[PDB]
Amino acid sequence: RDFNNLTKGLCTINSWHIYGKDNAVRIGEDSDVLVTREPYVSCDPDECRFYALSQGTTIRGKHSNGTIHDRSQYRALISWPLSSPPTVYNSRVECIGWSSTSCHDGKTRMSICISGPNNNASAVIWYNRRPVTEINTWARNILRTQESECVCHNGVCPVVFTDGSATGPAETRIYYFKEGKILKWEPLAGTAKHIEECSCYGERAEITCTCKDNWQGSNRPVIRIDPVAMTHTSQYICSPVLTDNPRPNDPTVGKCNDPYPGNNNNGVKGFSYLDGVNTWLGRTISIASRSGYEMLKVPNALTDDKSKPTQGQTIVLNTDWSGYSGSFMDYWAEGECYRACFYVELIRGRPKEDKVWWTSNSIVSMCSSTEFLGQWDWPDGAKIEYFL
Amino acid sequence: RDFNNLTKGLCTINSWHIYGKDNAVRIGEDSDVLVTREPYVSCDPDECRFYALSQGTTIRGKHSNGTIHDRSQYRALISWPLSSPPTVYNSRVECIGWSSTSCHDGKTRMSICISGPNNNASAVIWYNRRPVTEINTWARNILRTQESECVCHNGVCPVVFTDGSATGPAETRIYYFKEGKILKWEPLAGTAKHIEECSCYGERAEITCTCKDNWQGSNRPVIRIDPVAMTHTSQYICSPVLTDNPRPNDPTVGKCNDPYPGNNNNGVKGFSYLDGVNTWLGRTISIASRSGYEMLKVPNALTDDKSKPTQGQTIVLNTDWSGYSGSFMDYWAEGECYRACFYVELIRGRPKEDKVWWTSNSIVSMCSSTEFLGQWDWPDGAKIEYFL
Amino acid sequence: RDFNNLTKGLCTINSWHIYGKDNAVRIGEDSDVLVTREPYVSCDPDECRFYALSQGTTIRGKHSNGTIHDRSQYRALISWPLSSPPTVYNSRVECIGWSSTSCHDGKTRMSICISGPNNNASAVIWYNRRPVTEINTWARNILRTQESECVCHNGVCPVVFTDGSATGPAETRIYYFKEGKILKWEPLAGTAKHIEECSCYGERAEITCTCKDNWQGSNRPVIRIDPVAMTHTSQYICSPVLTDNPRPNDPTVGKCNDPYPGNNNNGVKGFSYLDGVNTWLGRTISIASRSGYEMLKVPNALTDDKSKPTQGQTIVLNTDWSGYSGSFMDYWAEGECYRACFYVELIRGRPKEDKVWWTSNSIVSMCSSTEFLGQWDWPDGAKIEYFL
Amino acid sequence: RDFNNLTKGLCTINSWHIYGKDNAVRIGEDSDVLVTREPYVSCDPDECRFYALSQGTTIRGKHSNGTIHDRSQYRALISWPLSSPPTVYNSRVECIGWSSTSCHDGKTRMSICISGPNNNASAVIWYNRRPVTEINTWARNILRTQESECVCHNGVCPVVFTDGSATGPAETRIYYFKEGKILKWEPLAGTAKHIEECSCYGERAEITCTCKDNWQGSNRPVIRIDPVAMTHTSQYICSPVLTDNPRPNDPTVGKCNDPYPGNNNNGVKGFSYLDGVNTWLGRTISIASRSGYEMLKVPNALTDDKSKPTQGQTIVLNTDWSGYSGSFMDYWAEGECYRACFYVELIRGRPKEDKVWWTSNSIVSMCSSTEFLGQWDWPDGAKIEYFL
Ligand SMILES: *[C@@H]1O[C@H](CO)[C@@H](O[C@@H]2O[C@H](CO)[C@@H](O[C@@H]3O[C@H](CO[C@H]4O[C@H](CO)[C@@H](O)[C@H](O)[C@@H]4O)[C@@H](O)[C@H](O[C@H]4O[C@H](CO)[C@@H](O)[C@H](O)[C@@H]4O[C@H]4O[C@H](CO)[C@@H](O)[C@H](O)[C@@H]4O[C@H]4O[C@H](CO)[C@@H](O)[C@H](O)[C@@H]4O)[C@@H]3O)[C@H](O)[C@H]2NC(C)=O)[C@H](O)[C@H]1NC(C)=O
Ligand SMILES: *[C@@H]1O[C@H](CO)[C@@H](O[C@@H]2O[C@H](CO)[C@@H](O[C@@H]3O[C@H](CO[C@H]4O[C@H](CO)[C@@H](O)[C@H](O)[C@@H]4O)[C@@H](O)[C@H](O[C@H]4O[C@H](CO)[C@@H](O)[C@H](O)[C@@H]4O[C@H]4O[C@H](CO)[C@@H](O)[C@H](O)[C@@H]4O[C@H]4O[C@H](CO)[C@@H](O)[C@H](O)[C@@H]4O)[C@@H]3O)[C@H](O)[C@H]2NC(C)=O)[C@H](O)[C@H]1NC(C)=O
Ligand SMILES: *[C@@H]1O[C@H](CO)[C@@H](O[C@@H]2O[C@H](CO)[C@@H](O[C@@H]3O[C@H](CO[C@H]4O[C@H](CO)[C@@H](O)[C@H](O)[C@@H]4O)[C@@H](O)[C@H](O[C@H]4O[C@H](CO)[C@@H](O)[C@H](O)[C@@H]4O[C@H]4O[C@H](CO)[C@@H](O)[C@H](O)[C@@H]4O[C@H]4O[C@H](CO)[C@@H](O)[C@H](O)[C@@H]4O)[C@@H]3O)[C@H](O)[C@H]2NC(C)=O)[C@H](O)[C@H]1NC(C)=O
Ligand SMILES: *[C@@H]1O[C@H](CO)[C@@H](O[C@@H]2O[C@H](CO)[C@@H](O[C@@H]3O[C@H](CO[C@H]4O[C@H](CO)[C@@H](O)[C@H](O)[C@@H]4O)[C@@H](O)[C@H](O[C@H]4O[C@H](CO)[C@@H](O)[C@H](O)[C@@H]4O[C@H]4O[C@H](CO)[C@@H](O)[C@H](O)[C@@H]4O[C@H]4O[C@H](CO)[C@@H](O)[C@H](O)[C@@H]4O)[C@@H]3O)[C@H](O)[C@H]2NC(C)=O)[C@H](O)[C@H]1NC(C)=O
Ligand SMILES: *[C@@H]1O[C@H](CO)[C@@H](O[C@@H]2O[C@H](CO)[C@@H](O)[C@H](O)[C@H]2NC(C)=O)[C@H](O)[C@H]1NC(C)=O
Ligand SMILES: *[C@@H]1O[C@H](CO)[C@@H](O[C@@H]2O[C@H](CO)[C@@H](O)[C@H](O)[C@H]2NC(C)=O)[C@H](O)[C@H]1NC(C)=O
Ligand SMILES: CC(=O)N[C@H]1[C@H]([C@H](O)[C@H](O)CO)OC(C(=O)O)=C[C@@H]1N
Ligand SMILES: CC(=O)N[C@H]1[C@H]([C@H](O)[C@H](O)CO)OC(C(=O)O)=C[C@@H]1N
Ligand SMILES: CC(=O)N[C@H]1[C@H]([C@H](O)[C@H](O)CO)OC(C(=O)O)=C[C@@H]1N
Ligand SMILES: CC(=O)N[C@H]1[C@H]([C@H](O)[C@H](O)CO)OC(C(=O)O)=C[C@@H]1N
Ligand SMILES: *[C@@H]1O[C@H](CO)[C@@H](O)[C@H](O)[C@H]1NC(C)=O
Ligand SMILES: [Ca+2]
Ligand SMILES: [Ca+2]
Ligand SMILES: [Ca+2]
Ligand SMILES: [Ca+2]
Ligand SMILES: [Ca+2]
Incomplete structure (x- = not known):
């Protein structure tokens, strides 16, 4: 109809309720479920769907051998009905590639997929299910993007890309697209020293x-974008409640404008809702591996370098595998505020479970409740032994 | 369009004709059919669909082992086209959880799923496929609901919940929802001493x-709700034709305001159409197990403590497994009256058939005819031996 | 929109072109294809679909054992997209039963399914996907109907039923339905001595x-219905070109008002287009079994007792299995005339191919061309050996 | 809505970006994917889909044995969602046959399938999913057509057919259809000496x-059609950059009006975009087999007999199997020009990979970018060993 505008503030997050869970690995032990990783969720005005990067093979298929690898010519961004598994028969390919983002602007959807060899990748921006724009690698070193939904305001949908080293300074860019066309792009500015896989909400x-x-950094960089002025700033979450993985143990004081040190060249896509006292941080429980997942209310985390938790909710037990996590919201829901939501990627297989030769995942996602709801833990649920 | 209003009375029930049957277990012996239990049927203005609680695995899948259990993080309310089986590829997840209800109000559908550990469950009410409201456990002991469709009138859709003991007094509540929001809730009143899994019609x-x-009670409690005044009453079916299972043999006089004794801490979801002389009771044939199923016309069963059958129809032979049963009607059909319908859950596997390690079911459903139709029996039809 | 009216005459049939073929048995050797029999084709204003009576099991499934049987509680009328196979995932159940008919009246579709034991069957007439009317057996001996599409005119859709013996006089009735309700029914009249499985067109x-x-009879009975006067007549195709199976060899003179003798208590559903010189008869090639299939132009077959072929077209070689055949037309196509079409059921398995324990079929269908097209033969195509 | 008119010129082709890839053979190693060959892509005003000629069996199915053969009664033109594989459950049959073409005219789609024995084939032209016209073989020797999309202008959609020898002069015809009806047909004229499998764009x-x-000819014949005057001309691509396969090594001067000699009675469907300096030729890398694939910018290839490459892009490595290739464009995209696209058929199995008994393929397709994008190679990706 008309372009959606971010006119509401966030609903008060007093807890998290279960939103979607596909049990992909369990079901896929005996059905045609595609092998995936890098999933997310994203809504259209009339439906919300699960998204991910397929590996172009089923879990039980012999081609599942080797799917620990990240970039091949057999991957594609696919979407499928909420809480269903990604099957060969119900998955819709949005575009071909090994890194992606997607978001609806209120009128139609924009999906971006990057493909190519490490030194010659390119992104192709689809809008209304058609290719509209292409951007060639500018640093010749794995052009890559969000791996979760972008967000739009009045037709403008900013997207964060990075090209260059993963272990040194790289070239991060913020592109402002409208109807799949480039209105403007900026180099990253602010105090963030390295940017990868941004999780956004508006x-x-x-x-x-x-x-x-x-x-x-073991603390997370944060980019705040003004989609009207098409400008942005960057810093790190000041809080001592560190949210990357692997990471060192929590200090009593964090860092606002520098990476918090202790762990180099590694990390996991994550997210947060930064809204004054209504601030909630997600993170793995383990400081060493992609194990467990919890939400922690850390009032003023973004700006208070001594902020510590005041409430919390366990999502995945530390004795269960987690993975990537990101934000999304249904901007087309009823009500006066936007209900914060997120998903957690539950990785199964390699490298942690090497008795099988594949790597895949399932999805669990939650949204906030103004109620103080009881908590449950939500594991993948599959028994690796069955796949042997 | 406009909210549906219960303006019609029931059609005269002179017999029951076959409405839907999915043969899920038979077909699932060699296709991707999800393991389920707690099914029901529910209509939208333009379509009627089968519903159930998936176990997050196929019947042939190795994860089917253990599906006798009731509440896990891998269950979800799913719906699928009438008389098709619940397959991985055609099932639509309504919400995540292990106890549910759902109903269309004429404009859109409300679905409710409860999830959680036994002492910290919570219900989340979805409306128009979006989460709108959440209710936390109030008795910290398996918050649970209908397991069949709710009914709406002018936007108001009452739902009966129970939280607390299954073998002692519990806290039953009647919530009146409108557009997924809580208008009001009452504690149970009347003479019913314990309430679980209500089967409703309007x-x-x-x-x-x-x-x-x-x-x-071996006789069934009955709750009558006025969706305008948003008030209700409760009693038991007075009839000596006892309809729970297990149950003692039929007496010559029943009880109107107390449970009829003889069997404690057990039972099966069931239903009835209470409409003066046009009253029909469903029940298992066996007084000991979930075996067989028949419909008995018992004029004035609700209020006459000596009422006995005047006509009947066998649905499932006593040499075949039955299970849960419930009511639903197509409130959007043509005509001057609402045609009473019901479904019977045909449980296969554990605990009765323990040579297999799973528990699932298929669905058979009937609706009334003003004709006096010949009867057939409708068994699940699968041979357990094939699954060995 | 508005009820369709049979305002056009038939197009001139100079040959038959390929319309649809699903290769169900071939494909089903390694995919989830339901076991069926008694198929047909029927059009809606916007789509034409394949129809059949499922056996409630896949061909490869273990429950396929025994599907030679005709009536069980696991059968249902299903429809699926033209030329696709009937799979567990794409088949839509129209109604439950072991004998059926279906037709669109221009506004919506009416589907009829009969179910029950031999002495207590009943038909339930669905209209707009809802049950509207029920008819109880009147002769208590396998109430049965067309097994191919009915035809409508201004809302009136006549259907022919038979109840009673298959080897002696029975009670055939012609019901005139409108919106699923019974407007009127007649007993069979005319000279036809026994009626079963009518193939109709308008x-x-x-x-x-x-x-x-x-x-x-080895010659076919013909019923002509006036859907306005709601009256009909009956006779036999006068032609010596006998079209039932099994049958005796063709004589030089047929019979107009009596069954042509030679074979008792047996036959196969078949059809014809009776339109003066534009008359075409379908029949198996074999006079002994359901083997082969050919179309023969027999000018004035209905009324000329010495009519013999003037042109012909082989559809299935005599070295290939055939089965039932029936008529249908797309009454909503463009043009000035209705294009005659038909389907042939290609039965595989029992009783002719007993190395397998199942019985199923695939569908081949043709429509007429005003051109004189070259012919091909269209066999099922599956190798039974593969199923062993 | 209204018939589409070819009002735009081509966009400048500076490189090719990835458009679609289904990874059919990889995925089909463990899922219900139909065996195909002769694929293409074609757009409707609201969606673009993959097309191909099914073999009426899955790859893993036992009936896959023998699918190297070209024409059987079990083939059909099917279409399925972009970048999905052709599965038994998501494939839509357009028509029955072993040679086809299809195109949308802006209002609805026309699909043509030819079937029959070698000496008695016939084409049936479907429009709006209904059969409208039939054409009988005129040379009694494998009537055959494009094997890729046709193109329409103001309702007129020309299609090129050939009937007669594949190794001597044959009878090629250009039919001009409108709403599935024949407006006119011409015999081939111009200097092209033999025509088969035309790849067109407008x-x-x-x-x-x-x-x-x-x-x-090892150089390709080119037919230019005026869809208004309904007339055409023919010649060969003058360029020395030879594009058929097998073919002799490139000379320094090509031929404009005669086949370039060196290889007889063989070839592969291919294509080109002939637009002055904006001219790009596709071809296998190998001069001996259907191996590899590259795009070469050869300014003025059509008219310059000494034109050589000025830029290029590798699509498939010479160490990977290719096959047929053809053109298509989304005539309903936004913008001021038509974006050239093409697909390459990636053949797997027989005859090159004879350890398996089947022959199938997957699809990779690209469209042009005005950017100078980095290149990647796009192989089928399946390991034949897995199928053993
Ligand atoms: C039914 O459901 C309800 C609803 O969920 C249940 O009630 C919930 O219970 C939760 C568990 O107790 C509770 O969550 C905790 O909240 C704490 C905050 O509340 C307390 O402090 C505030 C502030 O003073 C008080 O106002 C309040 O009254 C409470 O006293 C958090 O602090 C908890 O998180 C910390 O502990 C968990 C382990 O429990 C860690 O995993 C987590 O990471 C936090 O601790 C680490 O991080 C801090 C900060 O740096 C460190 O200081 C600390 O030492 C830990 O650091 C180590 O561990 C991390 C992670 O591994 C590592 O990185 C680091 O290096 C160190 O090694 C927790 O979030 C809910 O708030 C509560 N909800 C409600 C509404 O009440 C109820 O129990 C259920 N009922 C039943 C019967 O089960
Ligand atoms: C073709 O189709 C038609 C249509 O269906 C067939 O006709 C139908 O035939 C049905 C079977 O006969 C018949 O159903 C029965 O109806 C009885 C009522 O009708 C009779 O009584 C009335 C009232 O006086 C008369 O007017 C009427 O003329 C009849 O005489 C019911 O009473 C029957 O149910 C009871 O029996 C069945 C076993 O048959 C039990 O399963 C059932 O539970 C009922 O009996 C138990 O319950 C009562 C009440 O408490 C007890 O008193 C009794 O002892 C039984 O109790 C034991 O069993 C229960 C259950 O296990 C247990 O809990 C308890 O503790 C005890 O152990 C039955 O419903 C249809 O009405 C009739 N329909 C029509 C339209 O005619 C026709 O036959 C078919 N044709 C062919 C050729 O097959
Ligand atoms: C390319 O394609 C074209 C288009 O299809 C091909 O041309 C077609 O070729 C067809 C085969 O020849 C041909 O079909 C036949 O037509 C005959 C009628 O035409 C002839 O007679 C008329 C009338 O005088 C002439 O005008 C005309 O010029 C012809 O001479 C039919 O009579 C044929 O059917 C009979 O024969 C077949 C076997 O071929 C039987 O299966 C069939 O049942 C018919 O014969 C039985 O029935 C009759 C009637 O009772 C009996 O008299 C006769 O003895 C047979 O009876 C036995 O068999 C039956 C069945 O088993 C059994 O029940 C009974 O008891 C007995 O045992 C046949 O239909 C097309 O018309 C023709 N089409 C066109 C447009 O030309 C062309 O050849 C192809 N090209 C190539 C290169 O292959
Ligand atoms: C990141 O991505 C970018 C973007 O893709 C990469 O840059 C691209 O690199 C491509 C490979 O170099 C390049 O493609 C070539 O372009 C040549 C034309 O450019 C050159 O000449 C022009 C004209 O003078 C100059 O202006 C320009 O500056 C260049 O110097 C083509 O000529 C190339 O094709 C020929 O070579 C390939 C093998 O590389 C053959 O496969 C191909 O068929 C061509 O050669 C055959 O055909 C010609 C013509 O008849 C014959 O003369 C020749 O001998 C060959 O003939 C044999 O082989 C054929 C085929 O087997 C056989 O039939 C015949 O009988 C003979 O046996 C090639 O197309 C892109 O243009 C370039 N793109 C851009 C935008 O720059 C970049 O490298 C990537 N980065 C990294 C780090 O990898
Ligand atoms: C989001 O904001 C823009 C205004 O910035 C709204 O756009 C106006 O919409 C009306 C109706 O379409 C037009 O007549 C105005 O010209 C539009 N645009 C501008 C840029 O002025 C848009 O409608 C808002 N979105 C919603 C859902 O209300
Ligand atoms: C393509 O061209 C034809 C004109 O040749 C356009 O046809 C006219 O369309 C209008 C609106 O439908 C009619 O009133 C004219 O009579 C049409 N036809 C002719 C043949 O004159 C057609 O609209 C054009 N297509 C598009 C998409 O604009
Ligand atoms: C484009 C790409 O390959 N991104 C991968 C990502 C990066 O390799 C990592 O961010 C370092 O750059 O790692 C991980 C990861 O799980 O750590 C997943 C992504 N597939
Ligand atoms: C929430 C829940 O677990 N409900 C279960 C139900 C209850 O356990 C029973 O009603 C006693 O409370 O039992 C049964 C049952 O078949 O007896 C099924 C339900 N899954
Ligand atoms: C209702 C019913 O069972 N009809 C069956 C039909 C009849 O048995 C036959 O017409 C004789 O009555 O036979 C055949 C048959 O193939 O001969 C198929 C039908 N399934
Ligand atoms: C109608 C038909 O069979 N066409 C086939 C085609 C022709 O055989 C070839 O063009 C020579 O005529 O060959 C090839 C081929 O791959 O060479 C594929 C086509 N299936
Ligand atoms: C998987 O691939 C590895 C590396 O190629 C190989 O050694 C291994 O045996 C394969 N495992 C299986 C089950 O194919
Ligand atoms: Ca399978
Ligand atoms: Ca880090
Ligand atoms: Ca009880
Ligand atoms: Ca007969
Ligand atoms: Ca050639």
């Missing part, structure tokens, strides 16, 4: 992105 | 629910 | 049905 | 077709 005409500093 | 602006007294 | 406000005399 | 009210001279 409220009151502002887009907040919690990304990852693969190079040096 | 006619002439009144909603009748035939539930189950798990604690002490 | 043109210029007249409905012609070529049925089968299971009891005594 | 721009500025002109339709260009790059076909194949199976008999003598």
